[PDB]
């Protein structure tokens, strides 16, 4: 079990750790988060009590280093940092636990939610979507735009998601205009899966990462990306059976985990009704369609 210690908590902030969150008061004696499950990526995220504008956070994998949080009073935010002195780190963390100034990652033993939301997400891929190679963790916030959004402005602070565009020469083979636009199998299987992603796990990993950034940060370009990657599968007549079955599981847990009140901005009516009721795969997402209809019947 790993730990992300905090130097202190100088400003009042709602701190999130994966799907959990807790309020820390200004200068409350908070020294971070323990018992973080090894083997998964994690995200620790922040919303200041003073400025609910800009949720922000850090994706990290505790196997990649010892990481801590330290508030920066100049830049005005909780910053993740790496401690290279492993001995110094263990020592500090041991002390903080002794004084019990750390919250415990509150994982219920029945609960596979986080595994199921991050099954295919890998830090190495996160770090290529979020380019900042001096660090082993990745900063995202609400306002970051995607490489695709910049085509339609600072390239350093972008989300370099894979550009999907259904009305593009990459999506459409000369000679199969109608065929490729109505059945996107070529674009999914040849261009994207075989060509760019290499395999369905990397595709699902980006899809899952896009959703989580949309959910935790209200990142609009991420939500667009999540929906694009869903729609590309649902609009392909030819999809490996294992991908469909796993897609259904992936989306099920995303829909299950979405806050009830946020469904109106994070869920594209057109994409979902098309995917559940018009697309080739309208009959192939049984779990997703059942949870959607019982939880968000309004949208449909």
């Amino acid at each position: 079990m790993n730990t992300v210690p905090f130097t202190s908590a100088p400003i009042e902030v709602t701190i999130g750790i994966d799907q959990y969150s807790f309020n820390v008061k200004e200068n409350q004696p908070f020294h971070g988060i323990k018992d973080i499950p090894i083997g998964h990526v994690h995200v620790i995220h922040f919303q200041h009590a003073d400025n609910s504008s800009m949720r922000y956070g850090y994706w990290f994998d505790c196997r990649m280093g010892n990481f801590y949080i330290q508030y920066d009073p100049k830049d005005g935010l909780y910053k993740m940092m790496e401690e290279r002195d492993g001995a110094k780190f263990e020592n500090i963390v041991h002390n903080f636990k002794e004084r019990q100034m750390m919250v415990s990652y509150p994982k219920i033993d029945e609960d596979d939610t986080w595994y199921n939301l991050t099954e295919f997400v890998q830090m190495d891929k996160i770090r290529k979507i979020v380019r900042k190679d001096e660090n082993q963790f990745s900063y995202v916030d609400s306002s970051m735009t995607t490489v695709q959004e910049n085509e339609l402005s600072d390239p350093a602070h972008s989300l370099n998601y894979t550009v999907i565009n259904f009305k593009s020469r990459e999506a459409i083979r000369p000679g199969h205009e109608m065929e490729d636009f109505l059945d996107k199998s070529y674009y999914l299987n040849t261009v994207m899966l075989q060509g760019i992603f290499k395999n369905s796990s990397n595709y699902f990993g980006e899809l899952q990462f896009a959703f989580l950034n949309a959910m935790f940060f209200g990142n609009y370009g991420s939500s667009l990306q999540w929906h694009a990657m869903i729609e590309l599968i649902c609009s392909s007549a030819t999809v490996p059976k294992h991908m469909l079955d796993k897609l259904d599981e992936i989306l099920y847990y995303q829909i299950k985990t979405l806050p009830e009140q946020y469904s109106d901005i994070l869920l594209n009516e057109r994409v979902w009704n098309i995917c559940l009721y018009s697309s080739f795969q309208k009959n192939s997402l049984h779990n997703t369609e059942k949870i959607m209809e019982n939880k968000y019947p309004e949208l449909l």
């Binding site: 009305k167 020469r169 109608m178 636009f181």
Partner: protein
């Protein structure tokens, strides 16, 4: 964005454009089968492509053979339309190519956008006008070439005859739309109006009779009356 009353005169500026109407691409007669069920029998159609500034109508005749063994023909028709338009844009040199194509039905936007990806600098636009181009098959010489075709064919027509010799393209487009609106609302009355007087002939190279200016004003008046009336006759007013 969309073409409407407010940007109406853009049609007559010096940026070459085309209006594309697909309403006569896929045409069927509906009949009863021996077993008493219903079947369709396709008949030849056309893509009504009009340069609204000069008058040229690049009529691409859609022979029934293009539908043989195809499913979802109303959807294919939009893509066939797009494919034929794209082919015209490609055959043309860059300077002669249209800067914009306006489709008369929004269902053509995606098919044409997709077929025109090779031409990202050609704007594809819808319109909010209810243009009467579906009545182009009520022009006898156009209907005739379409029904007689035995193979795919493209025939170039001037839908303004020689009018631009005397009137502007704004005025010629208005005359055309009035004539087509009339023909669409009551083709019989409309055609009687146009051909009542034997002495006024349709030149062999023309589509409409050789009306003088004064005769066009009477004609245009009568077509208005027709359209106003048919509108009464319809709503009882």
């Amino acid at each position: 964005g969309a073409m409407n009353s407010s940007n109406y005169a853009e049609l007559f500026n010096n940026d070459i454009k085309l209006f594309v109407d697909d309403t006569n691409v896929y045409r069927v007669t509906v009949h009863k089968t021996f077993e008493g069920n219903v079947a369709t029998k396709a008949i030849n159609g056309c893509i009504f492509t009009l340069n609204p500034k000069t008058g040229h109508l690049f009529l691409k005749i859609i022979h029934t053979s293009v539908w043989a063994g195809q499913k979802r023909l109303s959807q294919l028709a939009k893509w066939k339309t797009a494919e034929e338009v794209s082919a015209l844009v490609r055959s043309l040199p860059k300077e002669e190519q249209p800067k914009q194509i306006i489709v008369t039905r929004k269902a053509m936007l995606d098919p044409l956008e997709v077929h025109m990806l090779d031409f990202p600098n050609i704007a594809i636009r819808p319109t909010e006008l209810r243009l009467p181009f579906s009545a182009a098959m009520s022009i006898d010489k156009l209907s005739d070439v379409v029904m007689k075709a035995t193979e795919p064919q493209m025939v170039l027509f001037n839908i303004y005859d020689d009018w631009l010799d005397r009137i502007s393209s704004y005025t010629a487009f208005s005359r055309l739309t009035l004539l087509l609106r009339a023909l669409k609302t009551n083709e019989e009355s409309a055609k009687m109006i146009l051909l009542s007087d034997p002495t006024i002939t349709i030149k062999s190279y023309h589509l409409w009779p050789s009306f003088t200016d004064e005769q066009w004003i009477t004609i245009e008046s009568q077509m208005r009356d027709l359209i106003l009336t048919e509108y009464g006759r319809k709503y009882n007013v």
